[PDB]
């Protein structure tokens with residue numbers, strides 16, 4: 056339910072991250088503004 | 099059976115250097131210039147109140 | 152130096168020296184532990200069993 | 205000047221490591237609207253006129 | 258080496274004595290006033306604070322025209338309003354601490370009066386000397 | 390409590406007054422000169438710098454034989470080369486800042502002359518007293 | 522601009538001269554005594570140490586009733602036990618360093634004697650003035 060002017064401003068990003076134990080990892084998701092993430096070059 | 103260190107969800111410990119000694123040593127506290135330290139020599143002093151010695 | 156004919160009011164509980172030296176001890180302990188090894192890699196899953204020895 | 209972000213943001217805590225907490229933006233409750241700032245048109249116009257003079 | 262020692266007038270140990278008797282040991286305490294990166298800074302700050310305290314006291318003494326003198330008479334009259342008493346019971350019966358406790362209320366007005374009297378005396382002396 | 394306040398001779402607020410009129414408030418500023426791990430060190434350094442400045446000024450005053458005195462006459466003659474003027478227009482018309490601006494050029498030679506005169510006077514007094 | 526320079530009485534370069542001849546340059550060295558986060562703290566500590574040393578020396582001078590004076594006579598007699606010699610060979614043949622080396626043993630007793638004499642003189646003067 057994003058307005059017309061907020062198209063692409065917010066991005067839902069999921070990634071792996073180290074937990075309290077280094078050998079274990081957790082897949083977590085968050086939201087980031089478009090001015091905080093840059094694409095790297097399908098997927 | 100899997101176990102973890104009790105501190106892992108709180109903080110990371112800092113292992114003490116083995117050469118460092120934990121043995122307590124006598125220490126003295128001295129006031130700087132312009133200040134004085136008063137000692138109550140009364141043997142029946144109960145921690146608070148007047149002291150004549 | 153004994154202070155003849157001198158009576159002084161003492162109060163152990165409302166003494167700044169106790170708090171001051173406690174803070175000094177805490178700070179000195181932290182400073183001593185600062186250069187030592189940081190034991191963060193130990194936070195790993197451990198396979199633990201009992202000791203029948 | 206009234207500056208507002210109307211999105212109902214949610215804070216989520218993630219345990220990076222020992223005592224390391226990362227705060228992330230979770231799912232937004234309700235509608236999503238652009239953050240905006242409002243000013244009085246007449247007051248701004250009169251201030252701009254005084255500045256111009 | 259016949260049993261002699263030091264027997265030196267030391268610290269405030271004479272504070273319990275009388276006014277005049279304790280006036281003997283003023284200079285030893287005056288000299289003691291200058292006895293001598295997270296802890297060295299604190300001890301240096303303590304030393305500097307003691308230095309400023311002593312220097313401010315010396316400046317106050319100099320402002321009243323009493324620099325370099327442990328005892329210095331002044332032209333300010335002693336108003337009886339502060340504490341009448343009499344001379345005999347002061348210098349022979351009362352200690353310094355009791356006197357400080359009694360006269361702790363009016364110290365600032367005494368300091369101001371000494372300041373004003375010394376300034377007036379300095380100007381009068383300058384005018385008199387320029388007259389000659 | 391009838392409307393009274395403080396009415397105290399404060400800071401340099403009297404600098405705009407005349408020479409003699411501003412000479413009243415020298416001591417208050419003299420007292421003010423001692424008003425009182427990355428930021429505490431800087432403020433301590435500022436305090437120590439102020440302390441050294443005041444102590445150097447006191448040493449300079451003592452070297453000229455004027456220690457402990459706000460006003461101290463000296464034996465050095467006032468050469469007219471620096472600024473002739475006359476006494477009447479100085480102490481009643483000109484301010485301290487204007488005088489400092491005018492005489493800022495020859496301050497060091499005045500300091501040296503006062504030094505030499507005081508040293509000569511001290512030696513002459515020592516010889517005269519040893520004569521007696 | 523005819524070849525002139527400074528020709529100023531500077532540092533201890535006159536120490537090799539005689540007693541009386543070297544007494545000329547006491548004040549220049551006295552002024553020099555105040556010449557002016559791991560290294561700034563150390564240099565600040567050095568400055569503060571110099572400040573305390575000079576201030577302690579000034580306090581010692583004031584305690585003996587000689588504040589503000591480079592040369593100050595005293596009422597303490599000169600016992601011949603320390604170094605008899607005679608006046609002529611002292612102020613015209615021996616240097617300051619040799620005298621300090623010779624008299625380095627009994628400095629503390631001299632300081633104590635000057636202290637006691639000044640205190641006694643101050644009390645006697647106070648009593649005499651109160652008599653008038």
Ligand SMILES: *[C@@H]1O[C@H](CO)[C@@H](O[C@@H]2O[C@H](CO)[C@@H](O[C@@H]3O[C@H](CO[C@H]4O[C@H](CO)[C@@H](O)[C@H](O)[C@@H]4O)[C@@H](O)[C@H](O[C@H]4O[C@H](CO)[C@@H](O)[C@H](O)[C@@H]4O)[C@@H]3O)[C@H](O)[C@H]2NC(C)=O)[C@H](O)[C@H]1NC(C)=O
Pocket residue numbers: 067068069084230231232
């Ligand atoms: C950013 O992107 C992330 C993923 O990268 C999104 O997170 C996912 O969001 C979806 C949609 O809400 C979540 O799916 C829902 O999760 C809930 C839990 O489901 C449980 O049960 C099902 C089986 O019933 C299991 O498979 C599942 O693992 C859970 O145990 C429920 O709210 C939902 O179930 C309901 O709806 C479905 C719809 O068909 C029905 O079939 C079910 O019967 C039931 O009624 C649904 O499963 C998903 O779990 C999230 N994943 C994670 C990892 O969190 C974020 O939402 C997205 N953010 C934004 C702002 O878009």
Ligand SMILES: *[C@@H]1O[C@H](CO)[C@@H](O[C@@H]2O[C@H](CO)[C@@H](O[C@@H]3O[C@H](CO[C@H]4O[C@H](CO)[C@@H](O)[C@H](O)[C@@H]4O)[C@@H](O)[C@H](O)[C@@H]3O)[C@H](O)[C@H]2NC(C)=O)[C@H](O)[C@H]1NC(C)=O
Pocket residue numbers: 155156271273274275
């Ligand atoms: C602590 O307080 C004590 C009690 O006041 C002090 O004792 C006093 O000490 C002084 C000397 O320092 C004495 O003064 C001397 O006293 C007598 C005078 O005679 C009178 O006293 C004697 C003995 O008490 C008595 O026999 C006579 O009848 C008189 O009454 C003479 O020796 C001298 O002239 C001199 O004045 C005080 O008398 C004495 N007071 C007493 C004992 O009550 C003590 O000194 C104080 N301590 C300090 C460190 O100051």
Ligand SMILES: *[C@@H]1O[C@H](CO)[C@@H](O[C@@H]2O[C@H](CO)[C@@H](O[C@@H]3O[C@H](CO[C@H]4O[C@H](CO)[C@@H](O)[C@H](O)[C@@H]4O)[C@@H](O)[C@H](O)[C@@H]3O)[C@H](O)[C@H]2NC(C)=O)[C@H](O)[C@H]1NC(C)=O
Pocket residue numbers: 403405406407
């Ligand atoms: C800032 O500058 C002002 C202007 O110079 C200062 O005003 C001066 O204030 C002083 C006192 O502080 C006055 O001195 C008094 O003046 C008169 C002498 O009579 C003459 O002046 C009056 C009034 O101007 C005039 O009616 C007569 O005909 C004379 O010409 C007497 O009351 C006293 O004896 C005393 O000398 C100055 O006259 C006055 N100057 C003026 C008003 O031009 C002011 O004080 C300065 N501010 C500070 C803080 O120093």
Ligand SMILES: *[C@@H]1O[C@H](CO)[C@@H](O[C@@H]2O[C@H](CO)[C@@H](O[C@@H]3O[C@H](CO[C@H]4O[C@H](CO)[C@@H](O)[C@H](O)[C@@H]4O)[C@@H](O)[C@H](O)[C@@H]3O)[C@H](O)[C@H]2NC(C)=O)[C@H](O)[C@H]1NC(C)=O
Pocket residue numbers: 535537538539
């Ligand atoms: C380092 O030590 C040198 C050796 O002692 C010092 O030289 C001395 O300098 C002073 C002046 O500063 C001279 O005093 C003058 O001497 C003569 C007196 O006549 C006698 O000496 C001359 C020359 O030696 C000789 O011809 C006569 O017969 C006498 O024996 C007069 O000019 C003055 O009145 C005044 O007294 C010393 O004589 C001189 N001593 C010598 C050359 O042995 C030198 O000054 C020292 N350096 C410092 C920086 O102090």
Ligand SMILES: *[C@@H]1O[C@H](CO)[C@@H](O[C@@H]2O[C@H](CO)[C@@H](O[C@@H]3O[C@H](CO)[C@@H](O)[C@H](O)[C@@H]3O)[C@H](O)[C@H]2NC(C)=O)[C@H](O)[C@H]1NC(C)=O
Pocket residue numbers: 069070071082
């Ligand atoms: C977080 O870590 C997980 C677990 O390692 C990563 O998932 C892995 O992603 C790779 C790359 O896409 C997968 O390889 C591919 O998988 C399929 C099935 O074989 C196929 O497309 C390719 O042949 C290739 O092998 C891998 O299977 C997958 N592992 C698991 C257990 O799902 C993930 O990419 C990491 N990053 C994020 C942001 O989640």
Ligand SMILES: *[C@@H]1O[C@H](CO)[C@@H](O[C@@H]2O[C@H](CO)[C@@H](O[C@@H]3O[C@H](CO)[C@@H](O)[C@H](O)[C@@H]3O)[C@H](O)[C@H]2NC(C)=O)[C@H](O)[C@H]1NC(C)=O
Pocket residue numbers: 206207208241242
């Ligand atoms: C800053 O100014 C803008 C523009 O005036 C404000 O947006 C406007 O806000 C009002 C009050 O919330 C909205 O009215 C409401 O809109 C909906 C749809 O009708 C409904 O909730 C209510 O019935 C009511 O009419 C209005 O639509 C909205 N937009 C415009 C273009 O006027 C904004 O609220 C101001 N911000 C602040 C912090 O004052």
Ligand SMILES: *[C@@H]1O[C@H](CO)[C@@H](O[C@@H]2O[C@H](CO)[C@@H](O[C@@H]3O[C@H](CO)[C@@H](O)[C@H](O)[C@@H]3O)[C@H](O)[C@H]2NC(C)=O)[C@H](O)[C@H]1NC(C)=O
Pocket residue numbers: 205206242243244
């Ligand atoms: C920014 O927001 C503030 C409030 O946070 C706005 O001020 C408020 O403005 C409203 C009208 O929009 C005022 O209500 C009216 O006030 C008076 C009586 O107080 C009267 O005209 C009406 O009966 C009505 O109640 C409200 O009082 C006022 N609040 C304050 C604290 O001033 C402000 O207008 C907003 N600015 C912009 C540029 O939108």
Ligand SMILES: *[C@@H]1O[C@H](CO)[C@@H](O[C@@H]2O[C@H](CO)[C@@H](O)[C@H](O)[C@H]2NC(C)=O)[C@H](O)[C@H]1NC(C)=O
Pocket residue numbers: 063
């Ligand atoms: C998701 O958003 C992206 C941008 O993050 C959309 O891709 C284009 O983005 C540019 C600006 O970078 C816009 O001008 C285009 O209109 C966007 N669309 C296309 C088709 O090029 C993308 O379309 C969005 N949708 C999906 C499903 O990824």
Ligand SMILES: *[C@@H]1O[C@H](CO)[C@@H](O[C@@H]2O[C@H](CO)[C@@H](O)[C@H](O)[C@H]2NC(C)=O)[C@H](O)[C@H]1NC(C)=O
Pocket residue numbers: 104107108
């Ligand atoms: C870190 O882990 C320890 C060990 O599990 C937690 O201590 C327990 O916390 C639970 C919480 O339900 C209590 O019921 C237990 O009694 C606690 N055990 C002990 C021995 O105290 C601790 O709370 C965790 N810390 C954080 C911040 O989550």
Ligand SMILES: *[C@@H]1O[C@H](CO)[C@@H](O)[C@H](O)[C@H]1NC(C)=O
Pocket residue numbers: 056234235
């Ligand atoms: C998003 O929009 C759809 C379509 O109008 C609506 O059904 C849904 O409830 C909305 N979701 C939220 C969370 O408002």
Ligand SMILES: *[C@@H]1O[C@H](CO)[C@@H](O)[C@H](O)[C@H]1NC(C)=O
Pocket residue numbers: 249250253
């Ligand atoms: C501002 O005020 C002026 C008159 O001062 C008026 O002409 C103008 O229309 C107003 N608005 C703007 C946007 O300038």
Ligand SMILES: *[C@@H]1O[C@H](CO)[C@@H](O)[C@H](O)[C@H]1NC(C)=O
Pocket residue numbers: 342343345346
């Ligand atoms: C001091 O005054 C009091 C009160 O009048 C008196 O009793 C006492 O004797 C006086 N002391 C003297 C005169 O030494």
Ligand SMILES: *[C@@H]1O[C@H](CO)[C@@H](O)[C@H](O)[C@H]1NC(C)=O
Pocket residue numbers: 358359360362
């Ligand atoms: C000093 O003033 C306080 C109140 O500020 C009063 O209680 C006390 O009695 C005063 N002391 C004297 C000695 O007058």
Ligand SMILES: *[C@@H]1O[C@H](CO)[C@@H](O)[C@H](O)[C@H]1NC(C)=O
Pocket residue numbers: 474475477478
């Ligand atoms: C000061 O000297 C000037 C210049 O000669 C003269 O005009 C003025 O009247 C003098 N001021 C006096 C004498 O007060």
Ligand SMILES: *[C@@H]1O[C@H](CO)[C@@H](O)[C@H](O)[C@H]1NC(C)=O
Pocket residue numbers: 490491492494
């Ligand atoms: C001081 O010297 C400067 C040049 O160094 C000169 O311009 C100025 O006029 C001099 N001031 C006075 C008051 O002589």
Ligand SMILES: *[C@@H]1O[C@H](CO)[C@@H](O)[C@H](O)[C@H]1NC(C)=O
Pocket residue numbers: 606607609610
């Ligand atoms: C100093 O005393 C010595 C030793 O008696 C003597 O030789 C010398 O001449 C004296 N100096 C004088 C009198 O100037």
